[model samples]
Target chain A: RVIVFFDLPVITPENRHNYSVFRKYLIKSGFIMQQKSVYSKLVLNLTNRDSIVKSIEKNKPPEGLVEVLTVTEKQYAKMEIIIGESKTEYL
Target chain B: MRVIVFFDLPVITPENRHNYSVFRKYLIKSGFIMQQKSVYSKLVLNLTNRDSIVKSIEKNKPPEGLVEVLTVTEKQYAKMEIIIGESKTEYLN
Candidate 1:
């Protein structure tokens, strides 16, 4: 699983535009919103994972902090939601 | 290592709001910095500190919301590529 976390300024016009574009790219790329400004996606193998990371790098907004973390399937699955259930998809 | 904590709690009621405030303050007191809304993270020097931090979180967690703890090595955490803007925390560099 590829988990992406980002912090972007939204006040300026350019900032907002870049933020919207980046977010749309994530959504279109099959990334699900795990939380506010945090998204995640699943890839089949290392090659697929690298491809996704490259795509993220390509579409990165030039005015914010975007961090990507990759974890194995087991690591992702082992995540403990101690109190509430995942509301990953509310669409 | 870095310990990241994420939580989501109900706040419709006064009691729930109080709990949220308490939990949030505890995290801050524990030296966790706010990564974003509802997310806090702390840097730990060793496995012992990491385990203790997670344990403290578990103990102080509210009963009505969801809370989770994630630990990642400094190496793994530093690999967080900044594809866009500069980092706010340059100490990590």
Candidate 2:
């Protein structure tokens, strides 16, 4: 599983535009929104993981922080949601 | 063991901002280290301690917005790959 965490400034018009662009890129790349600014995608192996991360590195905005994390399917399945309801059908 | 908390709260209104600040302060005072914008993590000795920490979070959670807690082994967390920015501190082995 691939998880993304990002914090982008949206105070300026250009910043907001860039933020929208980045978000659309993630959705178009097949990521599911785990929450407002967090997304996750499932991949087959390390190769696919690297490919996706490369794409993210290429497409990320010029400023702000964007992070990626990869965890095994078993490790991801153990994630517990202590608050709020999420439709994690795949998990 | 490690407990990671993820939260996204509204900050558009004054009340929303206050709630966010209060919840954030609670996490800091509870010894959680910031991992990302809305992500915080803390190390625990075992499942028992992890459970108690999670319980504390659940008890003090904000009345609004979304908050989630996940428990993972130290080994599992060490596998986290930072494809972009660097961590503010050194990664714990």
Candidate 3:
């Protein structure tokens, strides 16, 4: 099974409540929630990859977001798409 | 506040890895390195929220193998603990 990880930017004190809103989008986008901030193994069949990626890119919260995709038999992929205070300074 | 996420699963294959290894690679690629097998983090922050982490993992699942996501809040250091038995059957089918 292929697993994809998304490292979302830390939800700042101002926008932490928005976490649930973003999570709802993920649930609608075909990803299953496996843990608190962790997601389950996502089987990216040929048809769903583009839509899934697009959905994530479009509705992402202002907290900033990072993503990682892992193919069970293949290599893994990672990306940090947004910028935030945490991103600029070391935590 | 620090929140730690932990996921554990038994390996059915002979390879020296567990089922979550694939997911661990995903985390690593996402810049969250493996502090240990089935455990990961991006950075230590002062306001870690365990609920968000657990919710994220529940959204992702594999057809085979069991996946459990546990979060440890700042006040709550140790989150999940389990006892293993020789049978292993109790945990996995």
Candidate 4:
């Protein structure tokens, strides 16, 4: 799975527009919203990983700090969520 | 297994405020749950999982902010006693 992290300015219409565009890109590119600002996608293999990277670059907004972390499934399964079941869910 | 990040970034100028919001929103967007004013946490699959995320957070930190990361065993995380507030405020839209 790939987890994306990003921070961007949205004081102006242009920047706010960028957030919407980038968010749309995420959903269309096959990633699901993991939370308010975070998104994630599972990768089955190298090709899948490459494709995710491709889609990210294609749809990424140009103004922000972004980072992607790679983690495997078994690793994800151990996630410990606190109250309200907020760590991660069905996605 | 979880990684919690505590950060204090500047919010002085219009640009600073923008940067601050961007980073804060990023944490929220990235599957992290907020704690206090500057603290956030996320769950991970395991070691490689945790390490990769830690590395990313460290690599992307803003130069002026102070960031401290903590790895909590599942047992200890459940024991947190977070502060609860009942603030007096004038609500406005």
Q: Report DockQ per prediction, comma-separated.
A: 0.39, 0.35, 0.02, 0.02
Q: Write the per-residue lDDT of candidate 4 for residues A1-91, one digit (tens) a residue.
A: 6666556566999888887877887787787875445667888886887677765655567566555556666555544332211244575
True lDDT of residue A10, candidate 3: 39
Better of 1 and 2 by DockQ: 1
Fnat of candidates, each listed: 0.51, 0.44, 0.00, 0.00
lDDT by residue (tens digit), candidate 2, A1-91: 8888888878899889888988999999999999888999999998998899888877878667887777667867776665434345774
lDDT of 3 by residue, A1-91 (tens): 2233444443475455666666776676666765445454456473565455555555656544335333332321211111111124556
Candidate 3 docks with a DockQ of 0.02
Model 1 bad stretches (over 4 Å): A12-17, A82-91, B7-25, B33-39, B44-51, B59-67, B86-93
Cα lDDT for residue A47, candidate 4: 81
**Top DockQ hit:** 1
Give the 10-residue window scoring lowest on summed lDDT in candidate 3 chain A.
A76-85
**Candidate 2 clashing pairs, residues 3+ apart or interchain:** none
Specify the CAPRI tier of model 1: acceptable
Residue lDDT tens for model 2, B1-93: 678787988888998898888998999999999887799999988777876787788788787788877777787678776555333353767
Residue A48 accuracy (lDDT) in model 1 = 86
In lDDT terms, how accurate is model 3?
0.44
For model 1, what is the alpha-carbon lDDT of residue B28? Answer: 88
Worst 10 residues of 2 chain A by lDDT: A82-91
Best by TM-score: 2
User: What is the TM-score (0 to 1) of candidate 2?
Assistant: 0.84
Model 2 Cα displacement at A46 (Å)?
1.3
Scored against the true structure, residue B92 in model 1 reaches a CA lDDT of 55
Q: Candidate 3, after superposition: displacement of residue A28 in Å? A: 1.8
